Amino acid sequence: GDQRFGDLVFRQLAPNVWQHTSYLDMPGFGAVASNGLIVRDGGRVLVVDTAWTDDQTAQILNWIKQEINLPVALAVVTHAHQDKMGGMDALHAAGIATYANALSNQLAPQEGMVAAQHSLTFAANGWVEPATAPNFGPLKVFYPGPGHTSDNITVGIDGTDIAFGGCLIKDSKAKSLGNLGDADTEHYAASARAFGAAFPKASMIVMSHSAPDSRAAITHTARMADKLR
Ligand SMILES: C[C@H](CS)C(=O)N1CCC[C@@H]1C(=O)O
Numbered sequence: 001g002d003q004r005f006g007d008l009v010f011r012q013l014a015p016n017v018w019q020h021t022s023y024l025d026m027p028g029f030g031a032v033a034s035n036g037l038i039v040r041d042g043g044r045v046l047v048v049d050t051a052w053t054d055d056q057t058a059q060i061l062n063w064i065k066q067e068i069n070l071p072v073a074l075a076v077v078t079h080a081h082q083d084k085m086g087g088m089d090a091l092h093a094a095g096i097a098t099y100a101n102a103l104s105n106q107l108a109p110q111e112g113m114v115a116a117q118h119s120l121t122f123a124a125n126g127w128v129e130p131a132t133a134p135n136f137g138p139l140k141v142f143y144p145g146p147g148h149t150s151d152n153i154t155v156g157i158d159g160t161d162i163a164f165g166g167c168l169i170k171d172s173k174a175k176s177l178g179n180l181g182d183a184d185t186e187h188y189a190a191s192a193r194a195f196g197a198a199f200p201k202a203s204m205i206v207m208s209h210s211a212p213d214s215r216a217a218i219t220h221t222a223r224m225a226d227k228l229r
């Protein structure tokens, strides 16, 4: 179920996949959860997204050492906001290779983030250019278009039923698309549907600010985004 580890929560989603969850006070909103992923690929571990802070991110690495006890080969982060990239220095201190959309790395300094070490670029159809994501194993990285942010990316996990929408996708009962201050309101719906179409077999949709849901998270998110146009 949920495993509490210090101030974080970890939940196994599949034999080789766990969700990490960390919390930060957003004055006016309460203590806000953010989710990312941990994937074992044979003898190594892959991380999707940091926690909000360096200290929390170091705790993710402590949990991995305790529960998996294999090296973390790389991390990929899914846009330049604090919940996704706030712990980059902890990853770098640990010697982990880090990857982000080129645009996320460009935006990182102005957003108050540390850039990843490596930049992903994307084909016109949204799929990552494979040479920019070497040794990603089962992580299949897709740029669905601008939506929650200009730079948001998404990740499928081959060999599982899981696709990770990050902060682009909200759950099937979500009331709003949330803060749209960095959003692309025109392109959001199409970007949500493009995520679904990229990972058509994924039955478990993981996202930053809701628990895992069915594909109704994608349809519901797109349908709410239809009203922004
Ligand atoms: C700090 C982040 C980055 S997505 C944020 O803006 N959040 C997290 C949940 C509340 C809120 C929002 O997306 O509206």
Ligand SMILES: [Zn+2]
Binding pocket: 079, 081, 148, 149, 167
């Ligand atoms: Zn965000």
Ligand SMILES: [Zn+2]
Binding pocket: 034, 081, 083, 167, 208, 209
């Ligand atoms: Zn977020």
